[PDB]
Design a protein around this ligand. Structure first.
Ligand SMILES: C[C@@H]1CN(C(=O)Cn2ncc(-c3cc(F)c(OCc4nnc(SC5CCCCC5)n4-c4cccnc4)cc3F)n2)C[C@H](C)O1
Ligand SMILES: C[C@@H]1CN(C(=O)Cn2ncc(-c3cc(F)c(OCc4nnc(SC5CCCCC5)n4-c4cccnc4)cc3F)n2)C[C@H](C)O1
Ligand SMILES: Nc1ncnc2c1ncn2[C@@H]1O[C@H](COP(=O)(O)OP(=O)(O)O)[C@@H](O)[C@H]1O
Ligand SMILES: Nc1ncnc2c1ncn2[C@@H]1O[C@H](COP(=O)(O)OP(=O)(O)O)[C@@H](O)[C@H]1O
Ligand SMILES: Nc1ncnc2c1ncn2[C@@H]1O[C@H](COP(=O)(O)OP(=O)(O)O)[C@@H](O)[C@H]1O
Ligand SMILES: Nc1ncnc2c1ncn2[C@@H]1O[C@H](COP(=O)(O)OP(=O)(O)O)[C@@H](O)[C@H]1O
Lengths: 555, 555
């Protein structure tokens, strides 16, 4: 029991949301004698939600065991899997036992089974359970201490009748650990194990992009199992290989981790992921003027709210970055979030276009909701033009300047204009085609013209992109940028990448030669590799698009 | 019990509808001895409806406890959650007990559960309950006093068989508290609590736009809990921190309220909200001629109905404001409602276009119904052009001058021509593209040409928009407007906003400088800021659109 027990230390990598859950159900359970009636009624509707496997059960077990309670697990498909007439009996038994003990936490796991969407529970026998749960929750009002948590996979699957007020109304999120938190999950899941040095858990966490909770645990599991396999030749003692002699002389190495990290851990979950971006303004060369104009709207108004009130001005929410493709718009919108700690819930052009092509416009209403429950966040809708481009060309050419997605967005953004925590960044590459209504007061107002990087900006961005990689001495990333006068951002980066390719070849080539001669030559990128890469370099976004975007500078 | 009891004072912020409910079920319950047969049969079908959480249960408890009765709560999903054969037994038991006592109110909460739409209750066992309820209601006819209220989330979810006459036929609304009523809800929910001064509940209510009832209660709850948290360092006495010494020295501050107001109260409900607008004709500079022509049709005909009868003229319902984009059309239609107390149920262009793109034309029939139950109201359909614009350009270009939304509107408006309380204001920005049938007698008739603000109008509107904000002395908003001769409304406002931005920077900049020098400079907007803002100012709606709209002046 104690070997795999739970606590506030076992749960790791998700502290922002664990803080909310704790502070919700730790003060009214550790110090409930004040009863909260001196203040307000305590929470009674916690509805932890997240993708299958994120620590939802572990979080509840930690918040229960740590703050002494009477955790009574009511695993979802076990009250609905006990014939007819016994589901209600078991629910009432569990809740009456919970209230019998003064402190209590009732963790209804997989609430989608007990309480699905009401239009999907055709069977009436499965509907009596939902209604009984609703009435029992209503009866929990003013009952001693019956704080009840739920473990729905997604909050939209639960019956809305449960998600009202008095019932579940404290919907907290438990998102996918983006980075630097999944490393913590791996640390807690590996402290009992033996890491055989060279185990850069930081790199393992950085590589995993989508793995949630038990998936990272299974990654570590397969790493340990691969360590065992590599000794299988030494463990091949059919009788008694189980002896500790061939066991304790084992520990996971970097390659053992990698084998499962890349190949044998295909299981993963992909979706809109809230993430505190790692890129910083130091990583963005140039763009000083916009860097200043992007502080007047998201860092200064929040740092001095009183000044924006006495004078009187609704802060301009909804900057609409418009510039040549690949000019740091995404990098800028991630670095701003890095400055002011926030969640960069991005919605790229493919994700927006999938709803117009698939006619699934309702999903948009969830995106903003995901932003509503992840505040303070950013809503970098990238390539708003995509829907109109698919519809045709200039001025649509297949109808008007509207669509089935950016029209719903025009309503959700208006609704979110009340929320004073969520910025709505748009990054249309071609601005003369977006719906004009997304440029009106209240909605997206400010138009920051991310310019084509100027020569100084080219030098700065080339230096920034050549930071994590060796750059050598005579490379001279000063005149190298001067040869480029209209290159559009990424392309310059590509050049650098191309160099790091056109260079690495030589290295690895020499490497194989070092093998033939056996039967590192200037690792840093030399000017020869950069010249060879520039030999095939393209000025993406011809001057036509540059002057077209300048044509939108009139607005 | 008495601590959280209910009465006509506990319910607050919704008095217009509470008045109807009271007057319906207060005279036939407090003085029923006349039996109403001396007059007419009393109401027997109250069907309180509103978004989940608005005081629906509190309103019933107030109207029951205050006017002594026998409130017998029949919470929806508790008669349908008691096996088979006991639902009808419980309903009959409750109603027979209600009639046993002379006075009685039966508050069927969440009627959607007991009585859903008949096409969604596939299970027959859930259909016997609806039919039993219908028959029992029919038997309540001439029964002593069995006034029965319902708490459906939305009246369309209930079976129409219940909404007929003799059965539920007194469908009253309980809408989202718009403003100045939610402040009252907060006051009632905070009187027992301690507001630590500086708690501008007016501002808190003004900020919340969509919060309903229990959501504002939860806002206050989280404010109090945050006040407790801020003392957590002082409340950190694991043994006996519950002592009143560390409690009574607490009270909610402005920042504690704000933390939940902006960040930690994401829960909210958004929909078409009936609201008595706050903008007044004093806030609209210029537009005198239309201000007079907009009194001949909504204030004079209702102030002197007899004159419009003897002479003989159906008052022209359906003004169709047509002018350059952003020229006070919405402001005018809100100020008119502010003058004659009404409900400004607005339907913006995105909300109209969402039905054409989504092919959900039936929803229109609800909008007018929402207007029918919110009379006297206004129906400011903004940007009727939007649907045609999405369909193409001039004269449609993708077919005819019709559509799937403005065609249904052409029928609902004809049906509503009988209702002598609801004005139907249209605000198409481009008028040469709306369906011609919306310009015919009976339907929208009058065409008020909101003109491009003239120089005097520019001065007036600039002065009005610079009212809530400091304006200084030498700013001289007289020649400042003279430099603008074709600016279209909002743009001038934007200039002012731009100034209040281009000014505030300096202030906050000086502020941070005041910090560096430590290791307000002319707060009022100076002419320098206005000049800088005008340096980047655009004449929205070029003269082409002006002369195009003048081309529609021929009609
Ligand atoms: C009668 C009344 C009077 N009345 C007024 O007089 C006007 N008024 N009174 C108060 C404000 C106000 C509004 C804000 F929205 C705000 O922002 C705080 C904030 N917190 N976190 C972030 S995001 C942060 C940065 C990046 C994203 C992730 C983290 N922001 C932020 C900053 C800038 C823009 N958008 C959000 C602060 C404010 F003071 N306006 C109101 C009404 C018209 O009528
Ligand atoms: C044989 C018969 C003879 N016959 C007639 O001879 C003609 N006739 N007899 C009576 C009327 C009449 C009609 C009205 F519609 C009316 O309006 C009252 C009203 N109350 N509230 C508001 S809205 C108010 C303002 C803003 C919105 C929110 C609050 N209005 C209002 C005002 C102006 C326009 N629309 C509604 C008053 C009337 F007298 N016409 C009728 C028939 C053809 O055949
Ligand atoms: N955030 C986390 N921290 C530590 N362990 C986790 C986390 N998330 C998931 N796990 C691991 O995944 C397993 C199952 O957790 P989870 O799937 O969240 O609960 P449930 O299976 O009840 O949904 C546990 O054994 C736990 O060790
Ligand atoms: N300082 C910088 N300025 C501009 N671009 C940069 C900078 N640093 C890196 N980049 C590159 O610019 C690209 C930006 O692409 P992005 O603007 O997101 O494209 P899109 O706007 O089409 O989504 C990135 O792929 C990144 O590699
Ligand atoms: N108009 C209102 N005035 C005062 N309190 C309200 C109002 N609306 C909601 N509430 C609060 O919300 C809680 C639940 O009310 P409500 O949701 O309307 O009833 P029900 O939960 O039966 O639908 C109550 O405790 C009450 O204090
Ligand atoms: N007195 C006034 N006259 C004209 N416009 C004003 C006045 N006062 C404020 N405004 C501004 O004019 C705008 C009106 O926009 P609106 O006509 O609703 O646009 P649309 O017609 O496209 O819906 C508002 O945003 C408001 O800020």
């Amino acid at each position: 029991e104690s070997l795999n027990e739970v606590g506030y230390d076992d749960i790791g990598g998700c502290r922002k949301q664990l803080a909310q859950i704790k502070e919700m159900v730790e003060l009214p359970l550790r110090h409930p004698a004040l009863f909260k009636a001196i203040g307000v009624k305590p929470p009674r509707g916690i509805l932890l939600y997240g993708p299958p496997g994120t620590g939802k059960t572990l979080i509840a077990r930690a918040v229960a065991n740590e703050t002494g309670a009477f955790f009574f697990l009511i695993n979802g498909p076990e009250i609905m899997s006990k014939l007819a007439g016994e589901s209600e009996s078991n629910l009432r038994k569990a809740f009456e036992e919970a209230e019998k003990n003064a402190p209590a936490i009732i963790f209804i796991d997989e609430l989608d089974a007990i309480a699905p969407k009401r239009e999907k529970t055709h069977g009436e026998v499965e509907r009596r359970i939902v209604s009984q749960l609703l009435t029992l929750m209503d009866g929990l009002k003013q009952r001693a201490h019956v704080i009840v948590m739920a473990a729905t996979n997604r909050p939209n699957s639960i019956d809305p009748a449960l998600r009202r007020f008095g019932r579940f109304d404290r919907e907290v999120d438990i998102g996918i650990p983006d980075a630097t938190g999944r490393l913590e999950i791996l640390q807690i899941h590996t402290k009992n194990m033996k890491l055989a040095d060279d185990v850069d858990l930081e790199q393992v966490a950085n590589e995993t992009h989508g793995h949630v909770g038990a998936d990272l645990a299974a990654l570590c599991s397969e790493a340990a199992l691969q360590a065992i396999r590599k000794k299988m030749d030494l463990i091949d003692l059919e009788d008694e290989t189980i002896d500790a002699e061939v066991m304790n002389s084992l520990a996971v190495t970097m390659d053992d981790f990698r084998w499962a990290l890349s190949q044998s851990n295909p299981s993963a979950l992909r979706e809109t992921v809230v993430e505190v971006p790692q890129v910083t303004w130091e990583d963005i060369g140039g763009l000083e003027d916009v860097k200043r104009e992007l502080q007047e709207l998201v860092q200064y108004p929040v740092e001095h709210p009183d000044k924006f009130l006495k004078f009187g001005m609704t802060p301009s929410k909804g900057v609409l970055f418009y510039g040549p493709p690949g000019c740091g718009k995404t990098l800028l919108a991630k670095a701003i979030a890095n400055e002011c700690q926030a969640n960069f819930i991005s919605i790229k052009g493919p994700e927006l276009l999938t709803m117009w092509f698939g006619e699934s416009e309702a999903n948009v209403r969830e995106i903003f909701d995901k932003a509503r429950q992840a505040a303070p966040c950013v809503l970098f809708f990238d390539e708003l033009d995509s829907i109109a481009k698919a519809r045709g060309g200039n001025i649509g050419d297949g109808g008007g300047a509207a669509d089935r997605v950016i029209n719903q967005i025009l309503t959700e953004m208006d609704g979110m204009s009340t929320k004073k925590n969520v910025f709505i960044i748009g990054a249309t590459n071609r601005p003369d085609i977006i719906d004009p209504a997304i440029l009106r007061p209240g909605r997206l107002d400010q138009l920051i013209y991310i310019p084509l990087p100027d020569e100084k900006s080219r030098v700065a961005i080339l230096k920034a992109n050549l930071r994590k990689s060796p750059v050598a001495k005579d490379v001279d990333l000063e005149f190298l940028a001067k040869m480029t006068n209209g290159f559009s951002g990424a392309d310059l980066t590509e050049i650098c990448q191309r160099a790091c390719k056109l260079a690495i070849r030589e290295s690895i080539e020499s490497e194989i030669r070092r093998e033939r001669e056996r039967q590192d030559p200037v690792p840093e990128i030399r000017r020869d590799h950069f010249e060879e890469a520039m030999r095939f370099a393209r000025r993406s976004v011809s001057d036509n698009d540059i002057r077209k975007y300048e044509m939108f500078a009139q607005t």
